[PDB]
Amino acid sequence: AIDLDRHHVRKHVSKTARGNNAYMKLLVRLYGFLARRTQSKFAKTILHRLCLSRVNRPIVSTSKLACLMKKHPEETAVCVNTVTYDSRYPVPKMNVCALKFTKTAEAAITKAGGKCLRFDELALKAPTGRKTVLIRGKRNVREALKHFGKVCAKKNPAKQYKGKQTK
Amino acid sequence: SKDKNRSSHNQSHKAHRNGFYKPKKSAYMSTKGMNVQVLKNTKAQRKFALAKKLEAKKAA
Amino acid sequence: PLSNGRNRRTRKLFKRPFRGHGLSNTSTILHTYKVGDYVTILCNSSIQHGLPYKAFHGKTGRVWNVNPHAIGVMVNKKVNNRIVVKRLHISPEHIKPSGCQKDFLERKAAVAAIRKQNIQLKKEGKPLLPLPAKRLPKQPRPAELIKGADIKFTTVAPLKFEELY
Amino acid sequence: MKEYYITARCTDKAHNPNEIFRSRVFAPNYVVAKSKFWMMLKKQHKVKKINAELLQCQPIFEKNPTVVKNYQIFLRYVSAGGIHNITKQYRDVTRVGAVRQMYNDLASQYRTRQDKIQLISITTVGDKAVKNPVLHQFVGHHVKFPMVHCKPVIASKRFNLPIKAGKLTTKLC
Amino acid sequence: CKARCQAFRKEVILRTIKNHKDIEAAKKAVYTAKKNAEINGDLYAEADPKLIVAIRIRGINGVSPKIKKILKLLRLRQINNAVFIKANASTIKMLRLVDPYVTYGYPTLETVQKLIYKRGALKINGNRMPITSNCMIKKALGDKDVVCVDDLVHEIYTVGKHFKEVNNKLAPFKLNGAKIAEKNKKIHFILGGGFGNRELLINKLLANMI
RNA sequence: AUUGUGAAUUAAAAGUAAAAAUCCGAUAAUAAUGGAAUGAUAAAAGCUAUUUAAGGUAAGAUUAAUAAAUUUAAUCCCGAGAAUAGAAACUCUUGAAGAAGUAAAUUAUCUACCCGUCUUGAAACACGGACCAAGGAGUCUAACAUGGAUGCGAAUGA
RNA sequence: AUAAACAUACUUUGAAUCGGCCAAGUCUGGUAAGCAGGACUGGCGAUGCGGGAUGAACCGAACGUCGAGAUAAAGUGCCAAA
RNA sequence: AAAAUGAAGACAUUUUAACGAGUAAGGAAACGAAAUGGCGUAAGGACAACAAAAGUAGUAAAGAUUUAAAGUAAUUUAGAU
Questions:
Q1: Is the CB of residue C165 less than 8 Å away from at least one CB of chain D?
Q2: Domain Large ribosomal subunit protein uL30-like ferredoxin-like fold, which positions (chain E) (predicted)?
Q3: Which end of chain A is more exposed for a tag (fewer CB within 10 A), N or C?
Q4: How far apart are the C-alpha atoms of C8 and C3, rounded to whole Å?
Q5: Which helix or strand (DSSP H or E) is residue E54 part of?
Q6: Residues of B with CB below 8 A from C64's CB?
Q7: Is the Cβ atom of A17 within 7 Å of strand H at any atom?
Q8: How far is the C-alpha of E109 from the C-alpha of E86, rounded, in Å?
Q9: Protein C147 CA to nucleic acid G34 C1', in Å?
């Protein structure tokens, strides 16, 4: 035979839309077409982020969008994830393109004079991406990450899943 | 029922399947336990430089 | 089956060099170590206090912190299937400056001498010098001609066996 | 078996680079011949391949491969006991031919494989200097013997029939 | 439009003529040096070869980890696989270490020509594409000033400036079977075996192997 | 005490030092003539013919000067690119009186130790198994965690 | 210098497993053992194929279903292809 | 694995390249370029002659015995009694 370091195994990268969502299937069909034809790194990025699992597409709040759009007045924030609403802080005027908008987030963005776009309108208006800012939410804020590891560790102890008689 | 005590057979073959995990770069850059006076000087300048950086931000 | 003492199997490792007993040179305590330097850990049995563990003997490490009496050294240690970072604090008596970068610092200096000439030469507009050639493994030597005027021949043949008794 | 003429020089501190080593090496090819040459240098002059340059390696062809000569070979071989020096004589028309006989003859009479024999020298001796008990009889002028019990010869493999017809016979030949 | 095909064909001829000039001119210079040295009675020392072709002789079973790594560094991962290797202190020591598993020597130009023309291939986009045109060679090695198959042959034989990049693109050759040795492949070629350094005699083996 | 052979060496003649045959070295390649396995059928970056001419690096040829030359000059020859024109559609045998293939039985050459399990190792002189049918063994409730799909999101559930 | 993008760095969750055995240009106890125990590596276990008549470990070589060739260990009086 | 094409064709697309041994063990379902592909048993909700009589059945169901066909295989299909 042949002395290979390792045998061929499936590459651990998603290439389609997870689940049976008919609309999310068409979005991947649209951006898989755009990235192949336009050969734009922006469409390759949006296509890749559309294929992540739900846990890997964390939310972005209106407060975080406002901070990132401060020095970008006429721009379009583009986050492939649900956009929630931070009720603690005001929402300025800005245009956001996202997969889904919370009822309160959509009201707040619209009431400020902004716009809530979907990814087909963004591809229709800015296919290769010209006045957009790519944004993704934080991943390590998940509480599940606290318990990972060994809680007896000297350096970075875990968080000891609560249970029988935990003090 | 005497049994074999210990053997290092096949141990190196195991340790190299997933080879020796080198530490990342951040391991070598830790500063815990440095010289006391050196940390004081570094903290003093980082506080001075940050305040100067911040007042310009407040100015504009 | 050895024991688990801190200084086991050190009859030969911790022995002082032949005719090298007593005090050490004063260069050991006078040499100045700076953070980022390369040092070699060399346990000195004559100074029992602060003796580094025998597994670090002869290991080349980097200085990461300099204290009033001790020099912090950062070396690599091998564990089950990984490599960990060990940070120590040894007195200067148990370490020694390392020459691991001795020849590298000559090549760094030679290229700097050429670069300093190149900037000047470009100021006068004259052509600039080329950088020194990189080291190569011993290359196949080229063809050559040998003048036979000063050439002598000695025949080579198997030798008749002679008894050593 | 072929004979080669090999020369080389040593370029280092120990040996001055104005002294050239020569040898005449018998080997099946030039690659084997060079290996014998390098071991002679290494075991007799502390010369190694990594610090020496080969110059020439040319075959030596027999000048008149039609004249019968009595060859004498001085060799040393290693047995179970120790190391001994032997002097065997062969009658052939080529130097490489005589060495081929010597290797075959030593492997049979003494059961010594080739990698125990070092050919010190091979020369040519006179007609009356042959001392081999059997070979001494064929060096005279009036050698004459009837080869009896000849098996009949076959022109080629074409006529090598398995079963023949009629009776069989040898030849007083 | 497609007028570049004629210009490309002309350009290839110009390169081919130039390459054969360099090979023949260096061949002549050596020949006269030997001739003149004999006239003067002097001694002429030939230059050591700069190119080596190595063939993997044994299987993939029963190899020490040190030997296993070296054969992977030389891309000899299969029995009856030949690659071209530069000659220096590093590689010669590496080939000595794996001597029982390889046989190697110094190829001739005709050996390089036949191997590249018949068994040649290139790694394009991770695909071992066999050589069928100069356009595929121009695409892969255009940045290295190798635009036809004769630049590929000339560069390998003379070991030019871009030998590493050209050689690393050439996929390891897959060869046939042949009579490996006289006794067996368990002894060195010096003893009449199969492995080891065969010097120029590796061309006879490669003749029955290509 | 006249003569014979003779390795080796030498003179003169012949010889520009490429015939053929054999041996010793070096090689194994281009080609041709017959086949085999898997295919294809189409016209060309086929092949051929006519024009000019990049080239022929020991060696396409003849010459001359000279020569242990892959040393120089001349004029003959051929000729790559390119432009212009040319050409490939076939025979025979067998088959609903059974072709090709496939299946069953028998024969012949090669080939084949008892399944399951414990075990480093069983075809084992280790254990269960006389044969057949039907039944026959990771399920349900409850708590937690990870993970993939789902709704909503400072709320979610009610 | 050489190799490396289906490279590299991983993160999470989890299965089985920790009765082993053999070889040797190796070692210790023993008179010695197809004995007991170890260092390094390759194997058998988990592994069929070609050869050694037969064989867990030896030699070549590791396996999708096939056709044609050149081979390896090793062989060429008949069984048995040469 | 990478390129190309992609509302429906179809054989789970087209091309190129590398690869395919294996005990214990793992790879749940769904995921158009599909994050392994499938066969079988029984029951529940649907669909099954698109023009107002809409799957098969006394012009012979299920079952049983065999003969052939499809599938690498689990199995399926059809004829005869």
A1: no
A2: 55-102
A3: C
A4: 7
A5: strand E51-56
A6: 28, 34
A7: yes
A8: 15
A9: 70
